[PDB]
Amino acid sequence: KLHKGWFTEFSPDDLGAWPGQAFSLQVKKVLFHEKSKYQDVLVFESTTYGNVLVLDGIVQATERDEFSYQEMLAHLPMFAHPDPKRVLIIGGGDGGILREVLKHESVEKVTMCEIDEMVIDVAKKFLPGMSCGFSHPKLDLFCGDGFEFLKNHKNEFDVIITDSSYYELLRDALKEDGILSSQGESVWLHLPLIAHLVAFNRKIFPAVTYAQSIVSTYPSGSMGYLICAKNANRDVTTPARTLTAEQIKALNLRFYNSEVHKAAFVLPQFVKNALE
Amino acid sequence: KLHKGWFTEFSPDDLGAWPGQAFSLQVKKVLFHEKSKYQDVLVFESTTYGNVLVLDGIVQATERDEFSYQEMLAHLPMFAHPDPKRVLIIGGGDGGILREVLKHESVEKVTMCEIDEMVIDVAKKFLPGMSCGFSHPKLDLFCGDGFEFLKNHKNEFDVIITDSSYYELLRDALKEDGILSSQGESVWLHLPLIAHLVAFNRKIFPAVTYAQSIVSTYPSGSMGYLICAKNANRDVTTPARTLTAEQIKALNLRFYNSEVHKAAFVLPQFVKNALE
Questions:
Q1: Which of B26, B218, B260 sits opposite A268 (nearest CB)?
Q2: For a Cys-Cys bond, which of A139, A213, B229, B246 suits B207, CB 3.0-4.6 Å?
Q3: Where do the domains of chain B lie?
Q4: Of A216, A218, A263, the CB nearest to B266
């Protein structure tokens, strides 16, 4: 997919998508490019965004933006839950969600399901500051069939996060005041898809809300986040406890905070319409 | 700048900017492309974004997104002011800000400074729904030297909006409870520039705040907005009066509302740091 010193993130319709547009990064030099038994895995140093990881032609992480979507996707469920001790990450090969989860002292053990071990190694070698947590004693790594895992691990997890009736599996895997956080597509591109996803979870969970935030290297520039809670009294849109100016700096948070937490759920009109 | 059925919004460093990246739209057919005495003006029908207007190689408006930045840039100052009657738009050749301003019944007269009459005509011909308001009896159009204009029109305006000391001119042009709204760059790209702009306006106005929102076709996907008030007691971050579900639909608002209004000022950590 590399051209004239330029990488272009085309939509998969190239012979869930973003047809009719594409975003491009200027390349200094390729640093890796193999095929694992799952996906085309490419990393390059870019002119202005640092090292960037692309999987199957889709940008996954950038050194320039190492924090924005990861802080939101992890910290939303984490701070909304009143004492998250047991956490599951589905996806996360790059390390960014893991890094953010480990900032919560209440965590006793954190399990991560990543099928492609090559993504982890790449991230270890080419993307530090994204992949520090892979040596943490609280990390329980698993490369197995993740569906069977979830079938056999009911009532284990205070928080499940997924980098994306599977949602019934997720519901049963959570403990009783469990919160779920899932990567939630683009309101600019997949609004009928988002509407669909929210609707069926309202069948499964007593509380389902959809927040969003800016993310530069994501198609069209905002990622959404689906957040479902098992307890009908959990308001996931106000965090359990509220962070002070110094608690934030202590935690090296660059995007997320209590105020931002709350505002990410104040949706634009056209988004609010389609979710009723 | 047109290639293989694809238009690419490169950064001006092509031999205030976004070096090292670019965004692209798939072209069905060109619809216009002339040089006026000011700027290269190009409009094309795109595969998936409708007709798009590009000026000097910079995307200005799209039929897919006709509303998001327009609704915010215009309605922020408009609803923050308690009775805006006299309004000035600097820029606005496409018509979008004007459309949104005319929704406020309190407006008696609205003056617009656009140098390039070719942009207005193009917008009239190729972009309806963006350019309905060019026939409104409240619109006072002006194609003159806009600096001299502002020198001679002191204490006339309740609201000035600009599609972008200078800012001293603007301050003097405003009446006594005047509010100012200016296109405010990208927090992803021009943070030292945003920091600079906010700092000098805190010298000029007793209240200066910076809000932002998502905007798909803008570089990296969020436009910022600079909002300054002459009265030190004006809190621009809470609108004067608060819109109901029906007032919103009456006004055909697709992005903006009172809740959204307020949240656009809740800045991400890294942005909040750099503005202190």
A1: B260
A2: B229
A3: 1-64, 65-276
A4: A263
